[PDB]
Design a protein around this nucleic acid. Sequence first.
DNA 1: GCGATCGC
DNA 2: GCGATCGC
Length: 66
Amino acid sequence: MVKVKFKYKGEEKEVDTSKIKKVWRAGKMVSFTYDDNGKTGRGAVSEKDAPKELLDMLARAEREKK
DNA sequence: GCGATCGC
DNA sequence: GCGATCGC
């Protein structure tokens, strides 16, 4: 029940971490896709503004071996 | 341009 | 196959 705030295309947006499908890092930017009502939405935030919970999801993605 | 994806 | 995007 953690919300992530970001600005994609001028607009401000919030998505519950529960709808995030994938997370990854590019420098100090935490990037992700989420379930945008059936389709793939994209967003990113500074690691400085990443809710702890999103950072935990990132660490988990970075731990990945698949 | 990185990572990754969408929309061409 | 690359530009726009996001933050840097």
